[PDB]
Amino acid sequence: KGYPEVALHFVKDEKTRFSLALECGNIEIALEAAKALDDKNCWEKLGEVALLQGNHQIVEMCYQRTKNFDKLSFLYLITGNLEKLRKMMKIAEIRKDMSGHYQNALYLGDVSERVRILKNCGQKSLAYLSAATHGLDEEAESLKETFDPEKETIPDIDPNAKLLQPPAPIMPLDTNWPLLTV
Amino acid sequence: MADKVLPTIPKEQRTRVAHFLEKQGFKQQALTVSTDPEHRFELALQLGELKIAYQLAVEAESEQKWKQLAELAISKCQFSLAQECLHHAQDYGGLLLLATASGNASMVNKLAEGAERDGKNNVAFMSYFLQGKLDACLELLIRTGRLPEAAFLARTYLPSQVSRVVKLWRENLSKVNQKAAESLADPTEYENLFPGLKEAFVVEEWVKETHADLWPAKQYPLVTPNEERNVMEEAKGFQ
C-alpha cells in the first residue's frame, strides 16, 4: 500500500475489508472489522497487534472476550492497583482450580483462597504452611489433629522470597499509556 | 519348617513365593524375602520403609521412580527427604507446590537457575517477581521478545527501563517503519516521563520501604515470617 486513502477509493465485504485490515493494517477497518470478525484467531493475534500499534485501553476489551483473562489479570497486577484482579480471581476460582490460586496470592498478602484451598488439600498441611503468619497456624492444626495427624517431617521452606515491587509515587503505573505517532 | 527350606530356595523362587506372600498379605515378610529391584520397589511403595526404600533406590536410576516415589513420600509427609529426592529428581512442579506453600527464597535461587531452564517464558517471570526482582523479570523479557509487556513492568514499578527499553521496542517498530509505527518520547512531548511526575519511583517512601523489605509486616503470625500486601500497604505506599 501507499495510504489507506487508497482503501477508501475502493474496498468491500467484511471479509475483504478484513484482508485490508491486515494489508493496510487498516485497523480502523479493523475495529469494525473485528466487531464483525469473529474468526477468533483473527482477533486473537490482533488485539496484541492492536496494542502493538497502540491502546491497551481498547486492547483489554479485545482480550476480554478472548479469554486471555489471566493475561489481563497480569496487566492488572503489573499496574499497581488491586481490585480487578480480585474479581477476576473470584470468577475463575469460581470456575474450579488445582494450580492457579497462586495467581491471587503473591501480590497480595491475605487470601481467601485458603478457605477453598484446604478443601482441595484438606490435609491441614497446606493449611498450616499457609496459615501460620496471619497468626492463624492454629485452625490448620485443629483439623490436623482431628483427623489423626500425618505430618512428621517438612523441607526448607520458611517464607524467604520477596513479594515486593510496584509503584510508590513519582514515575507511574500505567493504567493508560500515552504515546504519539511522532 | 519352611525356613529350613528357605536356604534351599534362591533367586527366582523367592520371587514367586514372594508374590504368594504378598497374597498372604504378609507384606513385611514379603519384604524380607523381597528379591527384585522392581519387586522390592513396588512392594516398597506398599510398604513404605522410607529410608529403606531409598537404599533400594540407592541411586534410583530413574526419575520415574522418583516421581512415583515422590507422590508416595509426600503422602507419608516425609518431606525433608522428599525434597531431597524430588530435588534429586529436580522435578520442579510438585516440589514448587510445597516450597511455595511455606515459601522460600533459597528454593527460589536454585529454582531460578531452574527457571532459566524451563523453556516457556511465563513461569520464570513469576519467580522473578516472587523473589522480588524486576531486574530479573526484565532480563528475562529481553531474551523472549516480550517487548510491549516489558515496557509495562518497566514503567509500573519503575526501573526506568521504560526509557531504555522503549527505545529498543520502538526501534523494532522503527524497522517496521511508518512514523506512527516508530512512535516517540521520554521526558517530554509524547510522554513527559519524569516531567509527568506520578507513581513508580523516588527516595522517601523508598527509604521506608528499604527497611520494609527487611522487616516482617506483622499482624500476628509464626517463625515463618510476615510481609502482608493489602490495604494498608496501599496507604503507606502512597505516603
Beta-bridge partners for A90? none
- Write out B117-149 in H/E/C secondary structure: HCCCCHHHHHHHHHHCCHHHHHHHHHHHCCHHH
**Would you give the DSSP letter of residue B191?**
-
Please report which helix (H) or strand (E) contains residue A109, including its range: none
Q: Are A107 and B78 in contact (CB under 8 A)?
A: no
What SS3 class is residue A179? coil
Q: Are A132 and B222 in contact (CB under 8 A)?
A: yes
Resolution value (Å, 1 decimal): 17.0
Which residue is closest to A98 within chain B, CA to CA? Answer: B97
User: Is the Cβ pair B130, A161 closer than 8 Å?
Assistant: yes
Selected residue of A82, A129, A133, A180 to mutate for chain B interface (largest B Cβ count, 10 A): A133
What span, in angstroms and rounded, lies between the C-alpha atoms of B152 and B149? 5
Q: Are A170 and B200 in contact (CB under 8 A)?
A: yes
Phi, psi at B213, each rounded to 5°: -55, -45
User: Is the Cβ pair B200, A106 closer than 8 Å?
Assistant: no
CB atoms within 10 A of CB A67: 11
Sign of CA dihedral A9, A13, A15, A21: positive
Sign of CA dihedral A140, A142, A146, A152: positive
User: Is the Cβ pair B200, A166 closer than 8 Å?
Assistant: yes
Smallest Cβ distance to A132: which of B99, B183, B222?
A: B222
Sign of CA dihedral B67, B72, B73, B75: positive
Q: Is A120 exposed, middle or buried (0-12, 13-18, 19+ CB in 10 A)?
A: middle
Grid look-up 536410576 returns B61
**Would you give the DSSP letter of residue B6?**
G
Grid look-up 507513581 returns B199
What span, in angstroms and rounded, lies between the C-alpha atoms of A130 and B139? 30
CA atoms within 13 Å, Cβ hemisphere of B88 = 21
The C-alpha cell of B2 is what?
Answer: 519352611
What span, in angstroms and rounded, lies between the C-alpha atoms of B107 and B125? 15
**Would you give the DSSP letter of residue A161?**
S
What SS3 class is residue B217? coil
The CA-CA-CA angle for residues B67, B71, B72, to 5°, reads 115
What span, in angstroms and rounded, lies between the C-alpha atoms of B141 and B125? 9
What SS3 class is residue A170? strand
Q: Are B21 and B33 in contact (CB under 8 A)?
A: yes
What span, in angstroms and rounded, lies between the C-alpha atoms of B109 and B115? 9
CA atoms within 13 Å, Cβ hemisphere of A91 = 9
What span, in angstroms and rounded, lies between the C-alpha atoms of A107 and A110? 9
Beta-bridge partners for B199? A170
What span, in angstroms and rounded, lies between the C-alpha atoms of A14 and B104? 54
Smallest Cβ distance to B156: which of A48, A130, A166?
A: A166
Q: Which residues of B touch A58 (CB under 8 A)?
A: none
Please list the alpha-helical segments (H only) found in chain A.
5-9, 14-23, 27-35, 41-53, 56-64, 69-79, 83-93, 102-105, 113-120, 125-131, 138-147
What span, in angstroms and rounded, lies between the C-alpha atoms of A81 and B202? 18
Phi, psi at A170, each rounded to 5°: 65, 120
Q: Give the burial string for B123-143 (b: 16+ CB within 10 Å, else e).
A: bbbbbbbbbbbbebbbebbee
Grid look-up 494450580 returns A99
**Would you give the DSSP letter of residue A101?**
T
Q: Minimal Cα–Cα distance from A37 to chain B, Å?
A: 24
User: Is the Cβ pair A181, B98 closer than 8 Å?
Assistant: no
Q: Both ends of chain B: CA-CA distance in Å?
A: 85
Smallest Cβ distance to B229: which of A132, A155, A163?
A: A163
Sign of CA dihedral B208, B209, B214, B218: positive
The C-alpha cell of A111 is what?
Answer: 487470601
The C-alpha cell of B114 is what?
Answer: 531452574
A75: Cα separation from own chain's centroid: 6
* AA letter at A25: G
What span, in angstroms and rounded, lies between the C-alpha atoms of A170 and A147? 52
Please list the alpha-helical segments (H only) found in chain B.
2-5, 11-24, 27-33, 37-47, 50-57, 63-76, 79-89, 92-102, 105-117, 122-131, 134-144, 147-156, 161-175, 179-182, 193-196, 204-214, 231-238
The CA-CA-CA angle for residues A146, A151, A153, to 5°, reads 160
What span, in angstroms and rounded, lies between the C-alpha atoms of A160 and A133? 13
Q: Are A1 and A23 in contact (CB under 8 A)?
A: yes
CA distances from A29 to A24, A33, A35, A46, A49 (A): 9, 5, 10, 13, 14
What span, in angstroms and rounded, lies between the C-alpha atoms of B195 and B192? 5
* AA letter at A36: A
Q: Minimal Cα–Cα distance from A15 to chain B, Å?
A: 25
